[PDB]
Amino acid sequence: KRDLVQKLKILRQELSQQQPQAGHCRIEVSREEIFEESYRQVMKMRPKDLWKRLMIKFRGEEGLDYGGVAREWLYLLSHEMLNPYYGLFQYSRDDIYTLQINPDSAVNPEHLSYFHFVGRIMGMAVFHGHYIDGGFTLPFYKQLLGKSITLDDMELVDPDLHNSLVWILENDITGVLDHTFCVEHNAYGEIIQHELKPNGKSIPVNEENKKEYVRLYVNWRFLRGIEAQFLALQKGFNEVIPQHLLKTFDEKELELIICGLGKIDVNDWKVNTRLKHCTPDSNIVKWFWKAVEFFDEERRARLLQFVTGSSRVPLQGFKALQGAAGPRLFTIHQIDACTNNLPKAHTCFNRIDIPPYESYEKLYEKLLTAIEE
Ligand SMILES: CCOC(=O)c1c(C)[nH]c(C(=O)N(CC)Cc2ccc3c(c2)OCO3)c1C
């Protein structure tokens, strides 16, 4: 933990130097067209403009203070640009929670400029210390942060290919594997023969060159069909965050930064929760924590996402939980409502509204029904 905290202090220090002393990054956009209007304004700016202090205004709105409006625009846009509606990203069919690049994004001919823009925004979130659980896989984040893709990463991407490549590396393939440095794949009904390296079609894979074959294969498979999109996103990102500044961080550290604590702890959660219209020793609070304690990691993540908008636990735990404006502890609010209603969430204030359920079993079932699907 200490090593990571120190690297993050060094990173923040180096990034503050990149920020010009004078000038501002001025953005004026409507909330209703946040994506498109931010796209137009950010893409007219040079990379050096993106490092300047943010001066943001929402169209037709006065705003309380610039710092707060900048925090709100960056949070809202970073989440909005991930919406499948804009044609850049989509949820995996196999893994319903995983966000990935849409391989058919080219239906919008300007798609590359849009991915460049998203990269700039992800860079700007890093620059202003925002930790966003976008939903991408860890190897997606590692590629963006300049880390090499490993054969280990292929396990979940393509399990059969992973076993085959591990087999190539670990065993003598001579006279069993009959392959060359050319891979074939079916893209949109046509078989593409792709050479991993020059003259690939005429180079057989053998004991001497199999390590290079597996490395090139892993790189190609990982970005297959999304090469241009990923390159535009990386280019936008590297215009805000220099690659050299991240070389110090290892894979494990990157995982903790983007996804937060590896487990949702019910003890840390309950001692950092605010109570409204219920007391510490009440039945409703006792039954709520008894349900959360029974909940497994999956159910606790569903509960945290339901109440806060994210299943990411900050590295400092629940005492560091944040809402819309800034710091907002998780809140249990006992409401005066019909006990057949499900619990209601207000993700802005990390708050859950609970009717006065008559028994633990009733609270348990209603909470489970509310966090389903
Ligand atoms: C190595 C040190 O890393 C950092 O300092 C650091 C900070 C401050 N934030 C981030 C981070 O959260 N992401 C990385 C791009 C994820 C992310 C951001 C914006 C997004 C998004 C996902 O989905 C859409 O908008 C990192 C890694």
- Point out which residues pair with 185 in neighbouring strands: 192
Q: Exposure string (b/e) for 150-183, b if CB count within 10 Å is 16 or more? A: ebebbeeeeeeebeebeebeeeebeeebeebbbb
Residues with CB under 6 Å of ligand 1 are 11, 78, 82, 122, 125-126, 129-132, 134, 145, 246, 249, 254, 257-258
266-371 is a CATH 3.30.2410.10 domain:
yes
Contact between 78 and 125 under an 8 Å Cβ cutoff? The reply is yes
Resolution (A): 2.1
State the distance from the centre of ligand 1 to the C-alpha of 277, rounded, in angstroms. Answer: 37
Q: How many CB atoms lie within 10 A of CB 308?
A: 23
* Contacts by residues 220-227 (CB-CB < 8 Å, ≥ 24 positions apart): 220/183, 220/194, 220/196, 221/154, 221/157, 221/158, 221/161, 222/139, 222/143, 222/149, 222/153, 222/154, 222/157, 223/143, 224/185, 225/103, 225/187, 226/100, 226/101, 226/103
Pocket test for ligand 1, best of 42, 142, 257, 259 (most atoms within 8 A of CB): 257
User: DSSP of 267-318, one letter per residue?
Assistant: HHHHHTEEEESS-TTSHHHHHHHHHHHHS-HHHHHHHHHHHHS--PBPTT-G
Q: For residue 306, what are its two tokens?
A: 């339901």
In the block, which residue shows the tokens 């003598």?
A: 172
Q: For residue 81, what are its two tokens?
A: 């640009």
- How far are the Cα atoms of 2, 363, 370, 373 from residue 135, in angstroms, in the given order? 26, 30, 22, 17
- Could you give the CA distance from residue 63 to residue 69 in angstroms, rounded to a whole number? 7
Q: How many CB atoms lie within 10 A of CB 307?
A: 24
Contact between 127 and 241 under an 8 Å Cβ cutoff? The reply is yes
Known catalytic residue at 348: yes
Q: Exposure string (b/e) for 243-271, b if CB count within 10 Å is 16 or more? A: eeebeebebeebeebbebeeebebebbbe
142-145-149-152 Cα dihedral, nearest 10 degrees = -30
CATH superfamily membership of 2-146+226-259? Hect, E3 ligase catalytic domains (3.90.1750.10)
- Alpha-carbon torsion (6, 67, 308, 233), positive or negative: negative
Looking at residue 12, its amino acid is: R
- Could you give the CA distance from residue 373 to residue 371 in angstroms, rounded to a whole number? 7
Q: How many CB atoms lie within 10 A of CB 217?
A: 21
**Alpha-helical runs (H) found in 19-109:** 34-42, 66-80
In the block, which residue shows the tokens 């037709």?
A: 60
Domain ranges of the chain: 2-146+226-259, 151-223, 266-371
State the distance from the centre of ligand 1 to the C-alpha of 130, rounded, in angstroms. Answer: 7
State the distance from the centre of ligand 1 to the C-alpha of 43, rounded, in angstroms. Answer: 20
| CATH number corresponding to 151-223 | 3.30.2160.10
- Angle ∠(242,323,236) on CA atoms, nearest 5: 20
Pocket test for ligand 1, best of 132, 239, 241 (most atoms within 8 A of CB): 132
Closest CA to 110 of 29, 229, 30: 229
Q: What is the DSSP letter of 320?
A: G
